[PDB]
Amino acid sequence: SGRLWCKAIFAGYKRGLRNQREHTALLKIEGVYARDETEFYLGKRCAYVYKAKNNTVTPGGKPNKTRVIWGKVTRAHGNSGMVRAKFRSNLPAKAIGHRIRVMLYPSRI
Amino acid sequence: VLKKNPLKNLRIMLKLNPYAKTMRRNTILRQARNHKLRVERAAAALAAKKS
Amino acid sequence: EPYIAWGYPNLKSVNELIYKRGYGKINKKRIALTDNALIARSLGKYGIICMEDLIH
Amino acid sequence: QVLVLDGRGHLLGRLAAIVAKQVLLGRKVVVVRCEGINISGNFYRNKLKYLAFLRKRMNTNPSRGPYHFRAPSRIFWRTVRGMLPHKTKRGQAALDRLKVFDGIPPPYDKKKRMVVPAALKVVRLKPTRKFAYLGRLAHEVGWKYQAVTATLEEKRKEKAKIHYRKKKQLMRLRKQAEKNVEKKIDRFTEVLKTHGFLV
Amino acid sequence: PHCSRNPVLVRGIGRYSRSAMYSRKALYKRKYAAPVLATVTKPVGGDKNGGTRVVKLRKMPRYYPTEDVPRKLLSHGRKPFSQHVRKLRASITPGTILIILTGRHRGKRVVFLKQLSSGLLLVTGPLSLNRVPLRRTHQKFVIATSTKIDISGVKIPKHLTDAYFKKKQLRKPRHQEGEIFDTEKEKYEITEQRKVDQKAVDSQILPKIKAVPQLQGYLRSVFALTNGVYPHKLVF
RNA sequence: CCGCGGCGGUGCGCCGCGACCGGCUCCGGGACGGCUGGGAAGGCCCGGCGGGGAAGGUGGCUCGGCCGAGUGUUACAGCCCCCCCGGCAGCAGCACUCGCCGAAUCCCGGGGCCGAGGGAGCGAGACCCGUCGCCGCGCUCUCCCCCCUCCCGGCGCGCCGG
RNA sequence: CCCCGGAGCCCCGCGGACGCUACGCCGCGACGAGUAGGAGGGCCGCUGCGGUGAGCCUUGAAGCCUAGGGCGCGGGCCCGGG
RNA sequence: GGAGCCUCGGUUGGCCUCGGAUAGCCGGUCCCCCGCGGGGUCCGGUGCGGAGUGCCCUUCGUCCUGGGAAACGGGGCGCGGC
Ligand SMILES: [Mg+2]
Ligand SMILES: [Mg+2]
Ligand SMILES: [Mg+2]
């Protein structure tokens, strides 16, 4: 009856200064800021969840306007608890500075 | 042929050098032996502390 | 000198290099030492008939 | 869902740095009491540094050239604008989240407002070092509304002192209330200190 | 048909040796001194006039395709799911409590009953309390809370297994084309055996849960992440 | 037509799992060697031998209630410290993490990630298939016994006989 | 101590691919910047000739156009509709 | 109150002293001064801040009946005045 996903912001792509490598998102998971606090989140399912003009299908549901791009937090990115993700398609860039949901549900807990 | 890494893949190590089996049979047993003997020292030290 | 790092390897170093990255030169084709049949075929005329002999 | 940061006691660029990254991660921020921001380095030092910035103008038509904003809010906005990619769409979007004020006006004058302790003067400077209030600085470079901003803030502080007195009054009654009731909240109050509050 | 005369030391390393095993197995004293055309192989039947007829079991085919794929390469160690070994997080022990993370029973709290043959969990958030029946779940989509009921001596039915907790309907042909055929059928009906199973199991648990104060109320409730509380910080 | 029997290729579209191997990156455990056959330490205390700061001391003065606190001097040991002789098991590169270098003197278990890329059966009365090398084992064709007990059988949940 | 028109086959010397356009097919290694310049291959492309497709074509050739479907690393190509 | 294109972000709230930093916070004043408060002194508490943003508030299944502790609290987009 509430929220079963931890909040996270799409920081932007894995990139060098002047070559962005679009196939790898970086994820600022809310409340975690140490390459330490982040072994929880390794290998968790994650959703860029967004809605669009035309209708879609929906697993166990009637046709909707919301769509998602699924992905997976792979590894911890640099000291201050950023995390790398990788998504079944690359994230839009429209997406920068927006919510992506890091689930709990490939749990090892 | 795929190179399976001997150092991870026990049976590949054995294929290349069968004396590994024994060397590793020893050094499980050896380490267990000594681990037991450490507990036995620790129990005697606790008994000496109680006395 | 300023093109290399070098020095005196351990026993373990010689093992780890040979087992993890031991590749024969066998008819000028870099081939991985998957069996002693390879080492023997080439070095067996010296008494070297296995990975272990090679390491020694 | 929104930062409100009391810019008093902070350091101009030090705060702006932190605000920029918040703003780039979609955080809507408000920065309040910007005249109270204070800049390291003795006053005179910084006045000249501003006065130099004033000199910078597009010779052939100043009307185009770098617009030197006087108000401390706009100054602080300018320095945060200098740490975003503000020529981009995403940069421009980022600034649109940030909302700066000389003094502390009516939405936020009854909101609790945070303090970035990593930009704070008492922490980041040696006590024997000198600094400048961005107000004074703003005032002398042509900011019109110092005194107005002062006269409105004396009202606010008087208005707030009242709120605090009533707040205190409730807190006090609540401390009394517990003592009045502490045999019929005793086996609740016990359980809230096995799992470690109330201590 | 004796068991394994050397035990396991490590996966792939027996405790003993070659030489100890020779003596244990006793290879001394167990020394084994041991120094078509006309006749048709596999057809044959009966029959009347002329005589008996020689049939041919497995008769050569009446169509060859124009091209067909050519074998594979043996491949060593690739077991089918049934023959797999099954794991279980040490956290999940019998009569522990879970938070089911994924399905319709989502965030609902539950009691864990057993690991089935499959490797799935069997589960019950006693239908009574929670509205979660006898039900399968996966280890991987479940949080093993550090809260246990003592479920030791409850006789879960032997007959309830993977095979029973398994979806049922739909065959092939019928009328098919039009605006009909198995878009209806409509409802999974609960059945009476299923209701009887639940009734039996819950009663054994249900007293046990209650003994723990507030536990029923905990098992009624639903888990969800509020503000300021982060999975990685908190424990369950 | 029902068998979804045996084999072969497949999935309309979106999904998930599982175990096996390869390559990685981490985590947790343990067991060893060497040294100034580590240095310091701890613990027990005993007998001596001096030296130093500076003391349950004394003393000038000051500050508080003979006592407590703050400076100052000669300095023994009734606060300690340091050297020297002689001797105990508790040490152990020590979870009292004070300072190394390592591993035929080294092993076990666990997690995250990416990838699977090949295809030694195209016979007419008898397999549409295994498998090579390595590990051992495991088993049996040798007898013994012991235990537990899952199925089944028997006797009184207990005991006896795969 | 016997014969494969039958040992039943992990090797079979009695006969031999699903495979064998031998300018074909298959396996192992290694390597791959490039102006000027050189060489090879183009089932890349244009126009005409000898051959050849019992080719195609008023039941619609060439050309032209195409937010149609594809192939090829590419030169290019093939189909759908107009 | 009913349908119905489109644009999206979101997925508990926090309703506030002032400020200090070689200092602060809270009480209570027995006592004194000022306009239930404000200022003072004195005393008593806290101070790696529990009258803590390392915080607080809020609960997250629905109903039934039939006990206890808690109990006049909540509502009707309940309605008029200050
Ligand atoms: Mg080249
Ligand atoms: Mg050229
Ligand atoms: Mg939604």
Does strand H come within 7 Å of the CB of D176?
no
- Nucleotides of strand F under 7 angstroms from a protein beta carbon: 1-4, 8-9, 14-25, 30-32, 90, 92, 102-109, 111-114, 117-122, 124-126, 128, 130-131, 133-145
A53 Cα: distance to centroid of ligand 3 (angstroms) = 14
Contact list, D94 vs chain A (CB under 8 Å) = 97
Tokens of D8: 């008093």
Q: How far apart are CA E15 and CA B25, in angstroms?
A: 7
Residue type, B9: N
Chains touching A (3+ CB pairs < 8 Å)? D, E
- CB contact, 8 Å: C20 with chain B? yes
Does E10 contact B22 at a Cβ distance shorter than 8 Å? no
Beta strands in E121-186 (DSSP E): 121-125, 132-137, 142-148
Q: Are D52 and D58 in contact (CB under 8 A)?
A: no
Q: What's the one-letter identity of residue E36?
A: V
Please tell me which chains touch C, using 3 or more CB pairs under 8 Å as the contact test.
B
Nearest residue to E215 via CA among E151, E143, E121, E142: E151
Residues 11-50 of B with CB under 8 A from E: 11, 21-22, 24-25, 28-29
Is B1–C34 a contact, with Cβ atoms under 8 angstroms apart?
yes
Give CA D153 to chain center in angstroms. Answer: 14
Distance in Å, residue A13 CA to nucleotide G58 C1': 63
Q: Which of E144, E225, E228 faces A4 most closely, judged by CB atoms?
A: E225
Distance A66 CA to ligand 3 centre (A): 7
Backbone angles phi, psi at D49, to 5 degrees: -60, -40
CA of A65 to the centre of ligand 3 (A): 10
Please check whether strand H approaches the CB of D193 to within 7 Å: no
* C-alpha to C-alpha distances, D44 to A99, D15, D73, D141, nearest whole angstrom: 46, 22, 21, 12
Q: What is the dihedral of CA E155, E158, E159, E160, to 10 degrees?
A: 70
Please give the full DSSP string across E2-27, using - where no structure is assigned.
Answer: ---SS-EEETTEESS-SHHHHHHHT-
Is residue E115 a contact partner of residue A81, using CB atoms and an 8 Å limit?
A: no
Alpha-carbon distance of E232 to E236, in angstroms, equals 10
Q: Distance of CA D188 to CAs D175, D184, E213, Å?
A: 16, 8, 14
Cα–Cα distance measured from residue A15 to residue A49, given in angstroms and rounded to the nearest whole number: 23
Separation between Cα atoms, residue D172 and residue C32, nearest integer Å: 81
Nearest by Cα to E110 from E226, E219, E194: E219
Question: Which of A86, A85, A76 has the alpha carbon at shortest distance from A37?
Answer: A76
Give residue for tokens 């990254």. D21
User: Six-digit token pair at A79?
Assistant: 């000291």
Do the Cβ atoms of D24 and A97 come closer than 8 Å?
A: yes
The experimental technique behind this entry is: cryo-EM
Give the C-alpha separation, A41 to A71, whole Å: 13
> Strand D28-32 to strand D99-100: parallel, antiparallel, or no bridges (unpaired)?
parallel
| Three-class SS state of E69 | coil
Contact call for residues E148 and E91 (beta carbons, < 8 A): no
The answer to whether the beta carbons of residues D76 and D100 sit under 8 Å apart is yes
Token match 């008087």: residue? D158
Cβ of residue A30 lies below 7 Å from strand H? no
Burial A8-26 (b: 16+ CB within 10 A, else e): bbbbbbbeeeeeeeeebbb
Give me the amino acid identity at E183.
T
**D–E touching, 3+ CB–CB pairs within 8 Å:** no
Judge if the beta carbon of B1 is closer than 7 A to nucleic acid strand G. Answer: yes
Distance A97 CA to H2 C1' (A): 39
**Selection from A39, A30, A37 nearest residue A5 by Cα:** A30
Q: Please report where in the chains the tokens 């799911």 appear, as a residue.
A: E81
- Tell whether E147 is within 8 A of chain A (Cβ): no
Chain A residue with Cα closest to E108: A1
Chains A and B make contact, 3+ CB pairs within 8 Å: no
Q: Is the CB of E226 under 7 A from strand H?
A: yes
Task: Give, in order, the Cα–Cα distances in Å from E127 to each of A18, D165, E108.
Answer: 58, 53, 11
Residues forming beta bridges with residue C30, ordered by sequence position: C25
How many CA atoms lie less than 13 Å away from D24 in the CB half-sphere? 18
Q: Which two tokens stand for residue B42?
A: 């620790």
| For B6, nearest residue in chain C (alpha carbons) | C19
Question: What is the nearest CA distance from A47 to chain E, expressed in angstroms?
Answer: 14
- Torsion-angle region of E176 (φ positive above 0: left; ψ -120 to 50: alpha; else: beta): left
Beta strands (DSSP E) in D36-153 are 38-40, 99-100, 131-133
Is D72 within 8 Å of D37 (Cβ atoms)?
yes
Q: Which amino acid is at C30?
A: R
Nucleotide nearest to C25 (CA to C1'): G29
Q: Which of D30, D29, D31 is nearest to D10 (CA)?
A: D31
DSSP one-letter code for E59? P
Radius of gyration of chain A (CA): 14
- Taking the centre of ligand 1 as the mean of its atom positions, its distance from the CA of residue C28, in whole angstroms, is 24
Report the distance separating Cα E182 and Cα E83, nearest Å. Answer: 34
Does an H or E element contain A30, and which?
A: none
User: Cβ of residue A94 near strand H, that is under 7 Å?
Assistant: yes
Contact criterion met (CB below 8 Å) for D42 and D111: no
CB E110 within 8 A of CB E98: yes
Q: d(Cα A85, Cα A95) in Å, to the nearest integer? A: 14
Which residues does chain E have within 8 Å of residue A41's beta carbon, measured at their own beta carbons? 232
CA distance linking residue A77 with residue A15, whole number of Å: 12
